[PDB]
Design a protein around this motif. Structure first.
Motif, PDB file in Angstrom:
ATOM      1  N   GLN A  11       0.827  -1.205   0.000  1.00 28.69           N
ATOM      2  CA  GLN A  11       0.000   0.000   0.000  1.00 28.69           C
ATOM      3  C   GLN A  11       0.861   1.254   0.000  1.00 28.69           C
ATOM      4  O   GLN A  11       0.584   2.209  -0.736  1.00 28.69           O
ATOM      5  N   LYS A  14       2.446   1.612  -3.386  1.00 29.30           N
ATOM      6  CA  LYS A  14       1.438   1.974  -4.377  1.00 29.30           C
ATOM      7  C   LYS A  14       1.059   3.442  -4.263  1.00 29.30           C
ATOM      8  O   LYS A  14       0.867   4.121  -5.277  1.00 29.30           O
ATOM      9  N   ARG A  15       0.943   3.952  -3.036  1.00 31.15           N
ATOM     10  CA  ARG A  15       0.729   5.384  -2.853  1.00 31.15           C
ATOM     11  C   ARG A  15       1.905   6.174  -3.417  1.00 31.15           C
ATOM     12  O   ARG A  15       1.716   7.205  -4.076  1.00 31.15           O
ATOM     13  N   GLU A  18       1.592   6.201  -7.112  1.00 30.67           N
ATOM     14  CA  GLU A  18       0.578   7.177  -7.488  1.00 30.67           C
ATOM     15  C   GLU A  18       1.156   8.585  -7.472  1.00 30.67           C
ATOM     16  O   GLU A  18       0.848   9.402  -8.348  1.00 30.67           O
TER      17      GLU A  18
END
Lengths: 57, 49
Positions: A11, A14-15, A18
């Motif tokens: 997570q 992935k942030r 992004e």
């Protein structure tokens, strides 16, 4: 159970990815702003040069 | 100085060591870390022992 925190790592990354993608969008939007500003000023230049041409002519 | 979870498992019926012949019980207590320096020195140490 420990895969829960491995997924927490995923997570977080992935942030981060992004952020990288939106920052590439920021790069591209900066390039678009550069294009728009350059075309705006060169259009003013062209209009001014045409006006001076007509005045002197 | 590593602080990540432990993938634990045990080996039963310990097939002899490949190069000597020791039928001694084994197990794995594995952990992963991000630092490249760790990937050098920790692995150097484990090869040492």
């Amino acid at each position: 159970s420990q895969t829960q925190g491995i997924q927490q790592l995923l997570q977080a990354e992935k942030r981060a990815a992004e952020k990288v993608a939106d920052a590439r969008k920021r790069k591209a939007r900066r390039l678009k702003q550069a294009k728009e500003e350059a075309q705006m000023e060169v259009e003013q230049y062209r209009r001014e040069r045409e006006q001076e041409f007509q005045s002197k002519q | 100085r590593g602080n990540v979870f432990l993938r634990q498992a045990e080996i039963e019926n310990p097939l002899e060591d490949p190069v000597t012949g020791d039928y001694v019980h084994k197990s794995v207590f594995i952990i992963f870390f991000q630092g490249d320096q760790l990937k050098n020195r920790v692995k150097k140490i484990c090869e040492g022992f």
